[PDB]
């Protein structure tokens, strides 16, 4: 418990004071991650800091006259050279480099440290599973899985100068809104946890493990829900997903009485006087931020995202409209019924959900 | 008219030889009829 | 031998008189392939002929007033809906349907019959190997294999209203020229021949069999050399490829003395008077049209294509220039030497081959 507490304190200090962007602080940061580092003088005006590990080599070009980083290059020693370290922006011909941006657009090393920790994770845990190859290809397999399953989700890599596979929905204004981020994290619970390569087969329309011999140990594929943030939190039925797949449960620590705002809305008589609210939930609502979607759990991505989308479009809007100061409104886990007037369920199309909310708003206004 | 009938009978000969000998003999007799006329 | 001769006669009759494009002849053709067929009246002006097998369903819409085919739709009963039955043309927004084109652009059913025989082959031999999925994905794996091996070949699907994976080179005018066609054919020699799924792994840069349990029996993956056609024929060293991989050897039947024009050019004194030709071939030259590239033989695609390209650019041009009415020209299997002036080999880049031919032409002119 001393080592775990010390590591937690070290993580807290690293996050609380990331340091200023200087060549010395970048070198110290790389050395703190166990990266080999050397400095070369390319000219009287230019120095390169080169940092290396098992697979990754990072060259950082520093202009001595301007006191500024000029360029950053990632090179892999893998047979896979096609690792995307650029931001995916639609319509810019200049692929903006994530590592360069993390050192030029931010006031501190926090953005660079997080991106370097991610590259170091892939480096440490890549062998015959190549995680640089697999993580690049996974973004294509997820995009295909959504096309085959008729899911209206867009897949982008590398959003806002951060490594990750981002899942976007169309918002009310046609603006793309991130729903979730998929990335690899170290499995703190089980160092013997086998992480396999799963490919989405176009032929079977399923995830398949082609090579059960290709695994890495002590890594998990994590799906993080991107909250736009208590009303913007996503709540799940306690039995919606197996508790073994829940990495981060937001425990409302026992000294602030924040029920789900949903459950406080079954307890507090401050309703729209036109609606009698009926709760038909059989399970408790829990706030989940992170899911383990490793191995056979890749099928759950579409189910989790449909719930997140339904919860945002239907549940959160119903709650907002009921909470603003007699028809019966029945709210259950997968269906909502407004007397004999309108109903919608979790398995209906987004167009049915929008029509339900429009009709509900017209009645409640 | 004998020209389209000759064409058609020619084509179901060349499409389906696996027909039993009865159909082959009858159809060849039909073509012999058309060229006789 | 009676059945084999009868089948050969039936194939000859099918190819010699394909029949006119009429609803009745299309129905008879489908029934001759064992396809179930029914006709529906969609309107007073429109009839549909629907034909079905194990996996394939083909709807043919017929306009009774115009005496013309209006539309053709392919539907698969596989979990794989993404089978490309359109022609790949660069720059046309209208993906032209191969089956519709084969019934509207051609004077006879020959084009449609060949495309239907190919679909029926995939249908009959698909099971857990799905050949519709695998054949679609194979075009992507070959394209990648050429990128990783630095081969200057373009891969297209479905050229000139015919099913197949076409391998193209840039010709002298920047026009794309087909070198080879890859497709599936029934293995007439061994019904027990196991055809496995081979994937090109980006990580290993090799073909891998991920699922040795996924096989089909009695099918071969064939590479056919697309001759632009005796001087346009491609000749191979007899020991260049194992004789077991040779599907179609053009036997010069023993009543026309066509040596390779190359070997007649070692026998006939009608040379350019400036060149002394020396033959250093150790093997006989054979004309090969079709190769079995199934299973572990997928690596041979790049070697066969390099030979075909070298033979077209170097050998055929050297022969054309020598044959048009003293420097020593040594011609071997993998290298050509013009005295001490210029040399090129099979392993040099296309740019070295072009420079050799330019210099050779300047000397011989």
Curated annotation (Swiss-Prot), chains A, C:
GO biological process, one term: positive regulation of transcription elongation by RNA polymerase II
Keywords assigned: Activator, Nucleus, Phosphoprotein, Transcription, Transcription regulation
Pfam families: Med1 (PF10744)
Keyword Zinc found: no
Top-level taxon of the source organism: Eukaryota
Compartments, record wording: Nucleus
Residue ranges the record marks as coiled coil: none
Gene Ontology CC annotation, any one: mediator complex
Gene Ontology molecular functions: transcription coregulator activity
Main location: nucleus
Similarity comment: family membership: Belongs to the Mediator complex subunit 1 family.
Protein purpose: Component of the Mediator complex, a coactivator involved in the regulated transcription of nearly all RNA polymerase II-dependent genes. Mediator functions as a bridge to convey information from gene-specific regulatory proteins to the basal RNA polymerase II transcription machinery. The Mediator complex, having a compact conformation in its free form, is recruited to promoters by direct interactions with regulatory proteins and serves for the assembly of a functional preinitiation complex with RNA polymerase II and the general transcription factors.
Note: Present with 4675 molecules/cell in log phase SD medium.
Quaternary structure annotation from Swiss-Prot or TrEMBL: Component of the Mediator complex, which is composed of at least 21 subunits that form three structurally distinct submodules. The Mediator head module contains MED6, MED8, MED11, SRB4/MED17, SRB5/MED18, ROX3/MED19, SRB2/MED20 and SRB6/MED22, the middle module contains MED1, MED4, NUT1/MED5, MED7, CSE2/MED9, NUT2/MED10, SRB7/MED21 and SOH1/MED31, and the tail module contains MED2, PGD1/MED3, RGR1/MED14, GAL11/MED15 and SIN4/MED16. The head and the middle modules interact directly with RNA polymerase II, whereas the elongated tail module interacts with gene-specific regulatory proteins.
Name of the protein described by the UniProt record: Mediator of RNA polymerase II transcription subunit 1
Gene that this polypeptide is encoded by: MED1
From Swiss-Prot, chain B:
Motif segment (Nuclear localization signal): 14-36
Annotated localization: Nucleus
Full protein stretch here: 64 to 100 of 149
Protein task: Component of the Mediator complex, a coactivator involved in the regulated transcription of nearly all RNA polymerase II-dependent genes. Mediator functions as a bridge to convey information from gene-specific regulatory proteins to the basal RNA polymerase II transcription machinery. The Mediator complex, having a compact conformation in its free form, is recruited to promoters by direct interactions with regulatory proteins and serves for the assembly of a functional preinitiation complex with RNA polymerase II and the general transcription factors.
Miscellaneous notes: Present with 1364 molecules/cell in log phase SD medium.
Highest classification ranks of the organism: Eukaryota, Fungi, Dikarya, Ascomycota, Saccharomycotina
Assembly description: Component of the Mediator complex, which is composed of at least 21 subunits that form three structurally distinct submodules. The Mediator head module contains MED6, MED8, MED11, SRB4/MED17, SRB5/MED18, ROX3/MED19, SRB2/MED20 and SRB6/MED22, the middle module contains MED1, MED4, NUT1/MED5, MED7, CSE2/MED9, NUT2/MED10, SRB7/MED21 and SOH1/MED31, and the tail module contains MED2, PGD1/MED3, RGR1/MED14, GAL11/MED15 and SIN4/MED16. The head and the middle modules interact directly with RNA polymerase II, whereas the elongated tail module interacts with gene-specific regulatory proteins.
Name of the protein in question: Mediator of RNA polymerase II transcription subunit 9
Gene: CSE2
Family: Belongs to the Mediator complex subunit 9 family.
Domain of life: Eukaryota
